[PDB]
PDB file of C-alpha atoms and ligand atoms in Angstrom:
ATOM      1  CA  UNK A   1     -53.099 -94.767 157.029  1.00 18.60           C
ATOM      2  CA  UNK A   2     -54.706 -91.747 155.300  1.00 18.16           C
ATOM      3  CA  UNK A   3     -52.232 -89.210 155.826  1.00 20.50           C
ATOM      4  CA  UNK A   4     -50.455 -88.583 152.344  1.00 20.46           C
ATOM      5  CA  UNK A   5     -54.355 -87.739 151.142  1.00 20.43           C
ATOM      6  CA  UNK A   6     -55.025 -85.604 154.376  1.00 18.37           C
ATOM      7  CA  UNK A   7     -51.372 -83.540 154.121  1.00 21.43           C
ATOM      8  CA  UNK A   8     -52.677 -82.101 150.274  1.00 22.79           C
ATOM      9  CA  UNK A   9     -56.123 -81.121 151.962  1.00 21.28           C
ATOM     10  CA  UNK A  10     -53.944 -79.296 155.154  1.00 19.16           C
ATOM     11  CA  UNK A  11     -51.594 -77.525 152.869  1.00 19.55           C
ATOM     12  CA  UNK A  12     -54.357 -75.923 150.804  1.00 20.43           C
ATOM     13  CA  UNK A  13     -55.949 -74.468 153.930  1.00 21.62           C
ATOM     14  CA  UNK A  14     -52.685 -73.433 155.759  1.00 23.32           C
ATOM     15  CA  UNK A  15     -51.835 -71.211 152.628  1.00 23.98           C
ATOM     16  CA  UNK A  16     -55.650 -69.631 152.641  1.00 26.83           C
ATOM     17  CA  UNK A  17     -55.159 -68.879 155.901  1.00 27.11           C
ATOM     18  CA  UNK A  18     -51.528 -66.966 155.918  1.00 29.08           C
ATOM     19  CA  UNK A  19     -52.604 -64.913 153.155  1.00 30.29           C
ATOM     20  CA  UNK A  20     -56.084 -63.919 155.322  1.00 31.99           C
ATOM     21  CA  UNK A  21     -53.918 -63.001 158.075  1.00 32.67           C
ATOM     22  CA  UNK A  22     -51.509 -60.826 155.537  1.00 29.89           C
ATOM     23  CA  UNK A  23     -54.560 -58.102 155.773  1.00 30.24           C
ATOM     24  CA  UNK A  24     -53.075 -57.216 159.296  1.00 26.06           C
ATOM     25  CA  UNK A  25     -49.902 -56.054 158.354  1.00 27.42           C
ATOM     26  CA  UNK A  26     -49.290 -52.304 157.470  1.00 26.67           C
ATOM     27  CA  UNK A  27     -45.816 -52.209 155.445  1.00 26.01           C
ATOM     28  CA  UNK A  28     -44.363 -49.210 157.174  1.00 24.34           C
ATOM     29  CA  UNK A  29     -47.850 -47.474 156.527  1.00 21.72           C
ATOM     30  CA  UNK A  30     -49.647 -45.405 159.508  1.00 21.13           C
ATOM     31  CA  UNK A  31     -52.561 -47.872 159.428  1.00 21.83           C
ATOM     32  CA  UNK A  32     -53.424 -51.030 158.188  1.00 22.91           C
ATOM     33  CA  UNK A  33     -57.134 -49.648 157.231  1.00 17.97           C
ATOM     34  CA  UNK A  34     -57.500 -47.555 154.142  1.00 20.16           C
ATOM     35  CA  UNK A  35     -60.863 -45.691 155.193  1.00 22.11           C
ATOM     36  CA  UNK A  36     -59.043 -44.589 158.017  1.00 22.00           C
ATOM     37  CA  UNK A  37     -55.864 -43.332 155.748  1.00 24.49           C
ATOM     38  CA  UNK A  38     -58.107 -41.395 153.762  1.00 22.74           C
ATOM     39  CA  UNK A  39     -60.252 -39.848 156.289  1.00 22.64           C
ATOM     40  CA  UNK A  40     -56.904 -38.566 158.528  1.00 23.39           C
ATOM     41  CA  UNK A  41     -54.967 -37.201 155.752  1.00 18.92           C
ATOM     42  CA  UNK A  42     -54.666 -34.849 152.586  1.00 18.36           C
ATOM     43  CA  UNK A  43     -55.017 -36.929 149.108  1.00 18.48           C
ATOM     44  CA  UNK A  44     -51.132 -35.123 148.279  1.00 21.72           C
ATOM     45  CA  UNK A  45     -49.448 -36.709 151.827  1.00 19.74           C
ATOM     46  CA  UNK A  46     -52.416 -39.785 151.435  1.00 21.05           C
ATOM     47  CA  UNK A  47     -50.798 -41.957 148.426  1.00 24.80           C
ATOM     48  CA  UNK A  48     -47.348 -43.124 150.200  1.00 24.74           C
ATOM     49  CA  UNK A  49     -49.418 -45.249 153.078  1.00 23.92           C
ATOM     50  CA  UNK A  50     -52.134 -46.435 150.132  1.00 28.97           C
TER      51      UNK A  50
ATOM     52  CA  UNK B   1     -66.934 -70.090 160.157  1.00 27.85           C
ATOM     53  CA  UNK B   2     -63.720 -70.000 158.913  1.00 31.14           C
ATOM     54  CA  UNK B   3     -65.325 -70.168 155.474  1.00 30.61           C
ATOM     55  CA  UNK B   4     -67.349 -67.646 155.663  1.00 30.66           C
ATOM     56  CA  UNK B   5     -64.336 -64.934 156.862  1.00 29.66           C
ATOM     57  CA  UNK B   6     -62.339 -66.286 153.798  1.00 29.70           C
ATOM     58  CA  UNK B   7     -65.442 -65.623 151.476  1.00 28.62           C
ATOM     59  CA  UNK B   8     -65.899 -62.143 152.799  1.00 31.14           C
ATOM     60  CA  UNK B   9     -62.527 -61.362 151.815  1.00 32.63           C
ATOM     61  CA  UNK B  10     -62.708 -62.669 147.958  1.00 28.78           C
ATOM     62  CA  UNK B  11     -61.189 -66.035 148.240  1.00 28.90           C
ATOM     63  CA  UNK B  12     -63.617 -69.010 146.758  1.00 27.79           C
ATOM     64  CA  UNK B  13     -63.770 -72.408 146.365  1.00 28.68           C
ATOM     65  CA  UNK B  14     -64.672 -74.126 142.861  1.00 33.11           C
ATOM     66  CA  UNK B  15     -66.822 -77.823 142.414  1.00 30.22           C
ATOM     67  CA  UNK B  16     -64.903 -80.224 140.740  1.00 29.68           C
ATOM     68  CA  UNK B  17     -66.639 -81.534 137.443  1.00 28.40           C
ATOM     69  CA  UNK B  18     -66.911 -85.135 137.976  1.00 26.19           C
ATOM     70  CA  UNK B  19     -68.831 -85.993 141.057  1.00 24.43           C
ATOM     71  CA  UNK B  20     -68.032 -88.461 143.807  1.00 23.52           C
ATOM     72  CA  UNK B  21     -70.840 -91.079 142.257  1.00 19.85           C
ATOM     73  CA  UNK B  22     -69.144 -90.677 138.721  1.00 19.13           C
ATOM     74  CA  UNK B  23     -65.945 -91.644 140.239  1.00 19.34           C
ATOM     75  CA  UNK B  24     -67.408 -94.989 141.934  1.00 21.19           C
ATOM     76  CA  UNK B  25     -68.993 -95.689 138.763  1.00 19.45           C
ATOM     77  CA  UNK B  26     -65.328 -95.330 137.147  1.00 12.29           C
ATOM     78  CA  UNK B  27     -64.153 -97.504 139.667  1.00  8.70           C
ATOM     79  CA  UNK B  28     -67.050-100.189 139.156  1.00  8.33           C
ATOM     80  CA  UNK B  29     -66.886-100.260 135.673  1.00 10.02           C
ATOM     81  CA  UNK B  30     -63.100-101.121 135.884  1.00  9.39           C
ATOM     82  CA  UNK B  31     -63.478-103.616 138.515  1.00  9.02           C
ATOM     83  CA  UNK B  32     -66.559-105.370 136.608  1.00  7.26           C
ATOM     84  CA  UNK B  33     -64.083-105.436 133.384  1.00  6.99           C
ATOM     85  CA  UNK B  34     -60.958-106.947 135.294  1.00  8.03           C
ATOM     86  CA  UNK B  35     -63.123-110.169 137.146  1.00  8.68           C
ATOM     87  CA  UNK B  36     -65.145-111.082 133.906  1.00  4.86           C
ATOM     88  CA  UNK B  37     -62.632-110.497 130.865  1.00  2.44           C
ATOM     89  CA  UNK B  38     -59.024-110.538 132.770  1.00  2.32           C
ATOM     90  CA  UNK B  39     -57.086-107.970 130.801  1.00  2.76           C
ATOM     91  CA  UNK B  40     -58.658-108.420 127.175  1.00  3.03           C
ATOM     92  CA  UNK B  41     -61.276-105.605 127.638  1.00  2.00           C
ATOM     93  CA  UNK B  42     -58.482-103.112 127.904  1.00  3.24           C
ATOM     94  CA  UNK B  43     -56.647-104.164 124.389  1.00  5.82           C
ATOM     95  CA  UNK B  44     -60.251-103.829 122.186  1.00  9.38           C
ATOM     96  CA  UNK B  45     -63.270-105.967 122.814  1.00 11.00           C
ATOM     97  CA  UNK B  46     -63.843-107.819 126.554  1.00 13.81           C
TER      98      UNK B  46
ATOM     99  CA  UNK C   1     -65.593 -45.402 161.824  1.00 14.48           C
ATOM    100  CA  UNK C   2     -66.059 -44.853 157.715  1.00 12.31           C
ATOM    101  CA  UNK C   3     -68.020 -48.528 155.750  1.00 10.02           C
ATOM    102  CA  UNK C   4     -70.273 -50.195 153.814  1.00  8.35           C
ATOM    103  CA  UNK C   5     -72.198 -52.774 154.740  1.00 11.16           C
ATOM    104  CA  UNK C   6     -75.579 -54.101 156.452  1.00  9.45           C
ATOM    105  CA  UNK C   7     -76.205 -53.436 159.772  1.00  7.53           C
ATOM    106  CA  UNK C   8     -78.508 -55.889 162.017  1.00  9.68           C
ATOM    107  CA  UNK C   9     -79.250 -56.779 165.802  1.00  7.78           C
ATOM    108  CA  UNK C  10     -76.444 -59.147 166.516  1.00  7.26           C
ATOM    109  CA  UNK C  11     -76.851 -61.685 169.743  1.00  9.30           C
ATOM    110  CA  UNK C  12     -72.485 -61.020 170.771  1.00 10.22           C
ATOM    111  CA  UNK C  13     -72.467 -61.055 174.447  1.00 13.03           C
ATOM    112  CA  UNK C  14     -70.517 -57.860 174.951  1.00 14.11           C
ATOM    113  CA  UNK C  15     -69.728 -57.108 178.682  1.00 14.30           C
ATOM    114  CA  UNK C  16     -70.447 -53.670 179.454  1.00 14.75           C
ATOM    115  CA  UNK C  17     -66.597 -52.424 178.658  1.00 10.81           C
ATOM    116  CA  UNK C  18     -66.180 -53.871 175.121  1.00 14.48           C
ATOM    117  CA  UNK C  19     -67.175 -51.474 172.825  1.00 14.74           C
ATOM    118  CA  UNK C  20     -66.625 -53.054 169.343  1.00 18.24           C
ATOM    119  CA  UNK C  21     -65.850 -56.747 168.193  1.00 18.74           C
ATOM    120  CA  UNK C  22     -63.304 -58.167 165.624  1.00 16.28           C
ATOM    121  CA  UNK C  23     -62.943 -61.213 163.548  1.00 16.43           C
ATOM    122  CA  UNK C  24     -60.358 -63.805 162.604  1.00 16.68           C
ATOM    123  CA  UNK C  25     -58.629 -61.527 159.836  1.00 16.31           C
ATOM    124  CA  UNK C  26     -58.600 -58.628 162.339  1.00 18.38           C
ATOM    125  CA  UNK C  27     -61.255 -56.252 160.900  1.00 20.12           C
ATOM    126  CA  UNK C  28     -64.642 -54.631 162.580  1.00 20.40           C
ATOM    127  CA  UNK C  29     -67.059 -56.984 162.969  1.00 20.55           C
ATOM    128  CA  UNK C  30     -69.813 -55.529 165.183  1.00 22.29           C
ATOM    129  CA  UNK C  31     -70.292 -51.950 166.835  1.00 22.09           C
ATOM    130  CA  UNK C  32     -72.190 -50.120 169.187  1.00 18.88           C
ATOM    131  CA  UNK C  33     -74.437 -47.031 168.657  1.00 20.54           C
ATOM    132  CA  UNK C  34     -72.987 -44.601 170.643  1.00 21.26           C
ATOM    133  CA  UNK C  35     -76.677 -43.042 171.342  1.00 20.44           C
ATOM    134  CA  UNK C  36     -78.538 -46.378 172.558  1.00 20.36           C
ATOM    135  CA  UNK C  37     -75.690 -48.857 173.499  1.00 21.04           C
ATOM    136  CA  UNK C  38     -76.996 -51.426 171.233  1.00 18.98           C
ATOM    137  CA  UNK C  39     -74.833 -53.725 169.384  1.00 21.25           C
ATOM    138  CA  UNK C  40     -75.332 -54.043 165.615  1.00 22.31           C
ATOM    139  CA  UNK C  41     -73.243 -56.617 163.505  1.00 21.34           C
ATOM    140  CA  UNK C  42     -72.146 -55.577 160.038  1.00 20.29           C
ATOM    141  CA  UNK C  43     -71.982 -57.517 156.934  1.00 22.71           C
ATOM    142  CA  UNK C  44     -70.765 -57.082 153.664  1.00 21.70           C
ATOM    143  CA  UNK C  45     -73.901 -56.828 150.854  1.00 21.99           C
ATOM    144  CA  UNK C  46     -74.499 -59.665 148.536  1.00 23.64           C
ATOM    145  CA  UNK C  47     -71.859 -60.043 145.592  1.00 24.35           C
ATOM    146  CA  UNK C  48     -70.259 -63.233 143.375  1.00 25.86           C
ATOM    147  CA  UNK C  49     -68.718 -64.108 140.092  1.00 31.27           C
ATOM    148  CA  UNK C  50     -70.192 -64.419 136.744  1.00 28.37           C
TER     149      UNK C  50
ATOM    150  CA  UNK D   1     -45.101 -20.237 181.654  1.00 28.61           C
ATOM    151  CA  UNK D   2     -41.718 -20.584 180.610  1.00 29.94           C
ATOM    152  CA  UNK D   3     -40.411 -23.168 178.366  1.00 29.69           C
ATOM    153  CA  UNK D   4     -38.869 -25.352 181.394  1.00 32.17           C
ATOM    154  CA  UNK D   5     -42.350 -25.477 183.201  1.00 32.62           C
ATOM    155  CA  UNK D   6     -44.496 -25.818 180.193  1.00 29.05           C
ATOM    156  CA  UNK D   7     -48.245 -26.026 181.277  1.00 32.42           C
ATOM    157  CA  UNK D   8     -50.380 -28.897 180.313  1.00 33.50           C
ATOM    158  CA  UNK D   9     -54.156 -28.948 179.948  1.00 36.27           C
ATOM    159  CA  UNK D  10     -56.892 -31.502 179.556  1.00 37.16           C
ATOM    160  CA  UNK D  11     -59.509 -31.373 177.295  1.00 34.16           C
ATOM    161  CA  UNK D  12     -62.544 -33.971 177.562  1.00 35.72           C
ATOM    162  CA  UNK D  13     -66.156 -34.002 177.029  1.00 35.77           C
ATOM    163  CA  UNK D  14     -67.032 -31.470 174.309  1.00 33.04           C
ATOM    164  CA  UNK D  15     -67.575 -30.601 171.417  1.00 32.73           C
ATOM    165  CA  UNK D  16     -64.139 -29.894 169.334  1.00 33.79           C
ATOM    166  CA  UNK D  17     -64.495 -26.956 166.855  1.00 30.67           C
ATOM    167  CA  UNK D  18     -61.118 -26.253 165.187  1.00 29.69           C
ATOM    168  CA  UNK D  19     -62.575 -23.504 162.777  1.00 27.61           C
ATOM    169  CA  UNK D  20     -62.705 -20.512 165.118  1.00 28.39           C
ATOM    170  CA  UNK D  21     -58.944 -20.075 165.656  1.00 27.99           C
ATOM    171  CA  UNK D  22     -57.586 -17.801 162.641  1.00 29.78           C
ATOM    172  CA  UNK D  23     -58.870 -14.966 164.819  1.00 29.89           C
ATOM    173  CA  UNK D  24     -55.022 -14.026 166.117  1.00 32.34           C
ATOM    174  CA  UNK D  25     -52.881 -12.471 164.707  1.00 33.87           C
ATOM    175  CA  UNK D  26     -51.600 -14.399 161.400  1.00 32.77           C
ATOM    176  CA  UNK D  27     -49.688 -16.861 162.873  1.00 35.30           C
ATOM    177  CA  UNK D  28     -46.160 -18.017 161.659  1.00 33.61           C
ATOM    178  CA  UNK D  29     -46.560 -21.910 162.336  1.00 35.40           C
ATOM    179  CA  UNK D  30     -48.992 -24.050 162.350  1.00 37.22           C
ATOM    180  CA  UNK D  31     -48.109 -27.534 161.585  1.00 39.76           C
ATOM    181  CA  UNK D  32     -49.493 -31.300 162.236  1.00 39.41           C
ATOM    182  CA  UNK D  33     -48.106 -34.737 162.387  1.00 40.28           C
ATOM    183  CA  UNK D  34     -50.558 -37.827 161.388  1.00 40.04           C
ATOM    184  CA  UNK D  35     -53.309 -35.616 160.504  1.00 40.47           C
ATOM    185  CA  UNK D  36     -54.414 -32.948 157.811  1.00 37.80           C
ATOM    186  CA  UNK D  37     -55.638 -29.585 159.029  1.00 36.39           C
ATOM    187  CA  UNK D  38     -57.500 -28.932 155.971  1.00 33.07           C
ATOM    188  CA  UNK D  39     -61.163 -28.751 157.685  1.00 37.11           C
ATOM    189  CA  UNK D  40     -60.502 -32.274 159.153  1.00 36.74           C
ATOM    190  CA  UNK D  41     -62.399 -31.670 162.352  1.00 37.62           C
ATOM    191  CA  UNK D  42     -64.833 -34.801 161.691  1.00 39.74           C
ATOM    192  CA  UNK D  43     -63.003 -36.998 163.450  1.00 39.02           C
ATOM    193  CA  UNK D  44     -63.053 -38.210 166.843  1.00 37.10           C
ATOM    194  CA  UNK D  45     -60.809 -38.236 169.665  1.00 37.70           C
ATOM    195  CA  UNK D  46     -60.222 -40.276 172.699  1.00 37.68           C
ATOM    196  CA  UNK D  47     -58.804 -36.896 175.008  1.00 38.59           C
ATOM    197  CA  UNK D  48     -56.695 -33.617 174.316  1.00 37.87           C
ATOM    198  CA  UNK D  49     -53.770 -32.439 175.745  1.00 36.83           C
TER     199      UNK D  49
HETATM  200  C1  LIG E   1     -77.432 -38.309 175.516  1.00 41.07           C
HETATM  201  O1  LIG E   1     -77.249 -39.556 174.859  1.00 41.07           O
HETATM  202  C2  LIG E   1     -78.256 -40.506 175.227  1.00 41.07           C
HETATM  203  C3  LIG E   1     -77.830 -41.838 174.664  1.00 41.07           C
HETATM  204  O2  LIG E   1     -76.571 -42.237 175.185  1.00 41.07           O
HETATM  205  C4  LIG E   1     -79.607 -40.023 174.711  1.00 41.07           C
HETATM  206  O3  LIG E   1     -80.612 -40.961 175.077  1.00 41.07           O
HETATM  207  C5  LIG E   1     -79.923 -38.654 175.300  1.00 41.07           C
HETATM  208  O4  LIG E   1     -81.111 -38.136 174.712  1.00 41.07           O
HETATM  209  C6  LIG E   1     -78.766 -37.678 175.071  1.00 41.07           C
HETATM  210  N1  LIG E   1     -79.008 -36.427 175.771  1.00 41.07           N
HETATM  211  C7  LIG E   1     -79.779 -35.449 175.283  1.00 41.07           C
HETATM  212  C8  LIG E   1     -79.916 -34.231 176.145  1.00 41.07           C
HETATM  213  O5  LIG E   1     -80.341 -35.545 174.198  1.00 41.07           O
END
């Protein structure tokens, strides 16, 4: 009977979670990690992938 | 757990002002108004 | 493996091949020394809003 | 060897010290993909081939 009320509450958390998992993706970068972007390459070649 | 991952990653959750007692009280005082003055409590004096 | 953090003795079962763990948004979650094959989890130090 | 039987190597278990090689004669090339050269021998490596 609840639903319409429940649906709100659902939708919030679906969208926290989808941007969370956005933190995985890498854009065309070498890594999706920035410590290890800066600790494998030259600051000059470094700023494309950041 | 799932809170906790979210929080270490800079997204937070805010209280709402009004508390869930404050709301029943809303709700009582409404319902108190409606059985013992009908509907003249919400046109001036009940 | 460059971070900041707090490190402390973490109760993760790891079976002798897994070497480090991972959480939910896919990022480092504990480790193991490699000079006593114990497994420490990291946290992030205390912060908020004002 | 020649070019057509190129001769691979495998390098495990040590301790990886790129400093020591500008001992040759100046050499013409020396070029890497993914990684910097500049006194980036603080990482570490799975194996080398
Ligand atoms: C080799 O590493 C182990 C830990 O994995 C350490 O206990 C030992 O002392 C090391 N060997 C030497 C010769 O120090």
């Amino acid at each position: 009977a609840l639903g319409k009320l429940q649906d709100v509450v659902n939708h919030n958390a679906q969208a926290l979670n989808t941007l969370v998992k956005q933190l995985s993706s890498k854009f065309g970068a070498i890594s999706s990690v920035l410590n290890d972007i800066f600790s494998r390459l030259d600051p000059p070649e470094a700023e494309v992938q950041i | 757990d799932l809170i906790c991952a979210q929080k270490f990653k800079g997204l937070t959750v805010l209280p709402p002002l009004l508390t869930d007692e404050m709301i029943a009280q809303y709700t009582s005082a409404l319902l108190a108004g409606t059985i013992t003055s009908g509907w003249t409590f919400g046109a001036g004096p009940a | 493996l460059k971070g900041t953090g707090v490190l402390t003795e973490s109760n993760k079962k790891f079976l002798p091949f897994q070497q480090f763990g991972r959480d939910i948004a896919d990022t480092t979650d504990a480790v193991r020394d490699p000079q006593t094959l114990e497994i420490l989890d990291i946290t992030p130090c205390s912060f908020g809003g004002v | 060897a020649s070019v057509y039987a190129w001769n691979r190597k495998r390098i495990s278990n040590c301790v990886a010290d790129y400093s020591v090689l500008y001992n040759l004669a100046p050499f013409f090339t020396f070029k890497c993909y993914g990684v910097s050269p500049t006194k980036l021998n603080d990482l570490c490596f799975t194996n080398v081939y």
